[PDB]
Symmetry: C4
Subunit: 229 residues, 4 copies
């Protein structure tokens, strides 16, 4: 009946069986990289793949059939429905296998007891300031990318062509690798005063990326210092 | 009258209209990078640019006409007058478009509610120590640049020529990229005991740049630990 | 007798003599690098090596003979038995000399007084969260290595061949050096939309490596704020 | 008399005159890099240098003559006597000009009021743990340099020759630049299992360099939490 199926979806036996077969498919996705193992057991492994994908679709849509609107409030349901919906089509560049990320559900069972609850609570509570931090960083990258494209546009072939590639190059200047010997020394061969555009930028955006660490450390100590009042 | 004009400058309708047209020309500068869009809609877009910068000078000087000395106390007024006055000349290397940075005014509206007030209060209160930190860093770069120019002056063409380029090269050694395979291995081909000039330097200035992070984290927790007394 | 030998193993004279000869062989392996010193005093030096490893095996197995099961509870015993048992064979790639690491026992005597007790207590207490952090990081490297092998498998010769080398290359992208000019610019010569695989990855795993620093700083202040209640 | 000379050494007029001429020689050592300025005003400038260094020796030895043993307790006296005594000889590799670092004495006057007293107190109090941290790091570099020299000794020409150069190369691996494309990819062309020597090392020593930041942040908050009891 309706009540019996809503019991049987929440059965720990069959749910742990879903976890069993999904970590099984995770390790045979680890085995698919070894081409010889796919030469040896190929039809068996693609049978494993196709069967666990169709029964994965079966169990997710049965989770819909039991909890048509009751399935809405769970962010883990947001996670697994993202995994089903975005990775529904396999006629693409083989990237179905990110559904292995479904096994992240098992790491709910480690979030409870051994002191990582405070860390994940800090990670959850750091959201409404870190989003404003990344919006400020997007504004800085926007204005500096448009300034860099107005300056170093024509005479530079590949690092400042479009808006997206100029954003990419200034992002790589933020990641702090070879801005001198990959970006500056070709640029000072033409423009002798392009250094005064980079030197504030490498300061300000890495300083904001340090301020993010400051914000998450004070957010991870606010819950600690809550315990004295 | 005079009072009515001082009311009409503070009208939320026309002020939000200024914000509307400034984010409009901000995304128009986002569109100027795509040169096909400038090929198609060019006269319209440059009409947009010229008209909104003319009325931008109009509204800023009207803000002067209403608050001749009352406009002095606001650091946001310092900001917008910097943006207008330094970027008043367009007969230069195309860099007018940093007045898009004016839309930073809109991010006052996010500074109030969602917990970033403590972060920006930490960033405001970190000033009178971080200025001494950057003065110490400037002194270290000064003495190490003059020592580097006395040592590696003649026999190296471009990394230690002037004072500014030597300061630049030691700054890049502080940014920690290819000091070995871009700076050391040509240097040890001539001077076999020039390593002991770098190895203290890469330690001391990166250690001070870590101490800056220490100072801003303790300043971002001082406001937190103030709330128990 | 049995009791007298269990006293003489704990004799401070002979135990500090073991410490004397083990720091002696530490600086002897510091001297083995200079091959002229091995040309001059070589037979004496290898005599020193063979005699101290023979008597080292003697004293460790005498520590077993006195404390057959009483020797179990010490993690320092785990350390020295690892050093003896894993490096018992010298017919290998010359790597016996990591038994010099035995002198780490002497740094127990600095762990007591001068304020490093709090640091080593933080390092001991940071274990049951940092293990979950490294398990999460291993899962991320697993899924991103298999996704990288699906995407950049065939047409790239050495950076994405097996599973281990693809894991290695994405680890090097985590170490943040030349992902652009060593990994991206050959990749964008073929795939024009392979950047959107890297740009989330370099964000998420370096952000988790920053979160590790957050966890160890709040663990090093929890013992501090313990002292007010 | 004797008392009057011990007053006249502490005269604020002549002491501020020493500070005046030492910042004067600081800025003209900033000017010596411009060789045209040395072409124009050269004899005057070297006259300035020679006269103020001989009167610098005069005032330092007068500080000795007034306070023969009373000059011992000051670490600033340790600083200025280091500056005079180690840099007394000018017949060397031109490196006299580090006595410009004497102007650091003026930054005592900024250590008092504007909140940096807590930062420099944290920097003073971080000593007896950070020395043990750097001793541990020296031991790690010692054992890993000897292991790297035993493994990659013969077939590698310049990165693993002596003990000092192998220490230097593993230090550069700690500085995290081109360990892959400068150190690994030549090494995996011969040894296919040398990666398992690097991958623990780049983890452990950068993790200890992060733990240094942890120690200095908790030391900079211990003085903060001192103010509640």
């Amino acid at each position: 009946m309706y009540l019996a199926i809503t019991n049987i979806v929440e059965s720990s036996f069959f749910t742990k069986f879903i976890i069993y077969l999904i970590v099984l498919n995770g390790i045979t996705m680890g085995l698919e990289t070894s081409k010889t193992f796919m030469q040896s057991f190929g039809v068996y492994t693609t049978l494993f793949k196709q069967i666990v994908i169709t029964i994965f679709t079966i169990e997710i849509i049965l989770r819909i059939y039991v909890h048509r609107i009751s399935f809405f409030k769970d962010p883990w349901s947001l996670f697994d429905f993202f995994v089903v919906a975005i990775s529904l089509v396999p006629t693409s560049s083989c990237f179905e296998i990110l559904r292995v990320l479904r096994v992240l559900r098992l790491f709910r069972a480690v979030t409870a007891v051994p002191q990582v609850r405070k860390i994940v609570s800090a990670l959850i509570s750091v959201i409404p300031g870190m989003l404003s931090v990344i919006a400020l960083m997007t504004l800085f990258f926007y204005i500096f990318a448009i300034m860099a494209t107005c300056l170093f546009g024509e005479r530079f072939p590949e690092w400042f062509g479009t808006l997206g590639e100029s954003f990419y190059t200034l992002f790589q200047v933020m990641t702090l690798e070879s801005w001198s010997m990959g970006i500056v020394r070709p640029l000072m061969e033409v423009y002798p005063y392009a250094w005064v555009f980079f030197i504030p930028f490498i300061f300000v955006v890495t300083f904001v990326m340090i301020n993010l660490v400051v914000a998450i450390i004070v957010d991870a100590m606010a819950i600690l210092n809550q315990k004295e009042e």
